[PDB]
Design an enzyme around this catalytic site. Structure first.
Site, PDB file in Angstrom:
ATOM      1  N   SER A  78      28.258 -11.923 -87.774  1.00 20.45           N
ATOM      2  CA  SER A  78      27.441 -11.008 -86.982  1.00 20.45           C
ATOM      3  C   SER A  78      27.660  -9.522 -87.204  1.00 20.45           C
ATOM      4  CB  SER A  78      27.610 -11.310 -85.495  1.00 20.45           C
ATOM      5  OG  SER A  78      27.107 -12.600 -85.214  1.00 20.45           O
ATOM      6  N   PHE A  80      28.450  -7.900 -89.784  1.00 19.54           N
ATOM      7  CA  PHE A  80      27.845  -7.419 -91.021  1.00 19.54           C
ATOM      8  C   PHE A  80      26.344  -7.161 -90.870  1.00 19.54           C
ATOM      9  CE2 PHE A  80      31.458 -10.177 -92.447  1.00 19.54           C
ATOM     10  CZ  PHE A  80      32.330  -9.106 -92.657  1.00 19.54           C
ATOM     11  N   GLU A  81      25.725  -7.773 -89.859  1.00 24.86           N
ATOM     12  CA  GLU A  81      24.301  -7.574 -89.593  1.00 24.86           C
ATOM     13  C   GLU A  81      24.163  -6.510 -88.488  1.00 24.86           C
ATOM     14  OE1 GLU A  81      21.960  -9.060 -91.400  1.00 24.86           O
ATOM     15  OE2 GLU A  81      23.332 -10.444 -92.405  1.00 24.86           O
ATOM     16  N   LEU A  82      25.160  -6.445 -87.616  1.00 31.02           N
ATOM     17  CA  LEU A  82      25.163  -5.500 -86.506  1.00 31.02           C
ATOM     18  C   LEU A  82      25.341  -4.044 -86.949  1.00 31.02           C
ATOM     19  CD1 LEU A  82      25.264  -4.992 -83.452  1.00 31.02           C
ATOM     20  CD2 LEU A  82      27.749  -5.340 -83.593  1.00 31.02           C
ATOM     21  N   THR A 120      19.506 -12.000 -96.485  1.00 38.31           N
ATOM     22  CA  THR A 120      19.683 -10.574 -96.226  1.00 38.31           C
ATOM     23  C   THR A 120      20.695  -9.988 -97.204  1.00 38.31           C
ATOM     24  OG1 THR A 120      21.548 -10.723 -94.646  1.00 38.31           O
ATOM     25  CG2 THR A 120      19.311 -11.027 -93.766  1.00 38.31           C
TER      26      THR A 120
END
EC number: 3.2.2.6
Lengths: 151, 152
Positions: A78, A80-82, A120
């Site tokens: 998470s 790394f996406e946050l 992603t």
């Protein structure tokens, strides 16, 4: 720059645990000689935690995601996406990611979520860890991981 | 457009904060206040397009409700919103208002910091603290605040 790879795992079964927390790090650092950044050993959780992770990843030649069952459940990926800069790094191909699969993704949502995570990441390489047999020194698993690492 | 609020929550495999999240919260908003909610476990059938379906359903809602219980924090139930490009945009560019209901007393430097970062990604945000079962009683300061944050 500073590290050969940033190790990303969750630690709260048995073989998968020993692999992610011990075998993997030991093989990489003690057998191959790579310099790893292991958060639980090298990171001091403080008020700039999010910023420190992004910085330390940026200072690593690779980002290793150890996808064990607990990692899937807790969504250890998470951050790394946050974090905006990290996510952009992933999408842009600024970070080479080595995703090691240590769990048969059971579940429609988990599977699709993981599929979305992969989509992603531009510079992504997935390596399957079938089990303890893969631990044996000089196995196809290790040869592949060694190839994906720097030097 | 189609819904007043998309309910984002997490559910384990006990009965206080999870009671609120799954039972009380939904019944109060729909039965009493008469709102129309999109509740995944009731209106969403997971398929090969799950990710896009969530993005589409959220986009069809006037509000995003995040029920932050300890489990939701442990499982990082908010992840999909940062993972899906469109959803993340909606939060950052303010295409949707988010009502974050804190049920747990967020402890631990990392969880606290991740939640802080999550909030910084949301332009239109309001946080309501759910202290305990006492806030569940009819027309309490909690329900008054929530209704206010809802549409209509």
């Amino acid at each position: 720059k500073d590290y050969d790879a940033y190790l990303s795992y969750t630690k709260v079964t048995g073989e998968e645990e020993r692999f992610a927390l011990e075998i993997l790090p030991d093989m990489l650092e003690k057998h191959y000689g790579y310099k790893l950044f292991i958060p639980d050993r090298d990171l001091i959780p403080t008020g700039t935690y999010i910023e420190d992770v992004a910085r330390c990843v940026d200072q690593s030649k690779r980002l290793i995601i150890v996808m064990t069952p607990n990692y899937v459940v807790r969504r250890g990926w998470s951050i790394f996406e946050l974090e905006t800069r990290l996510r952009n790094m992933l999408v842009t191909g600024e970070i080479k990611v080595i995703l090691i699969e240590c769990s048969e993704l059971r579940g429609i949502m988990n599977y699709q979520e993981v599929e979305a995570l992969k989509h992603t990441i531009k510079l992504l390489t997935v390596i399957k860890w079938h089990g303890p047999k893969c631990n044996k020194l000089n196995s196809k698993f290790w040869k592949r991981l060694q190839y994906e690492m720097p030097f």
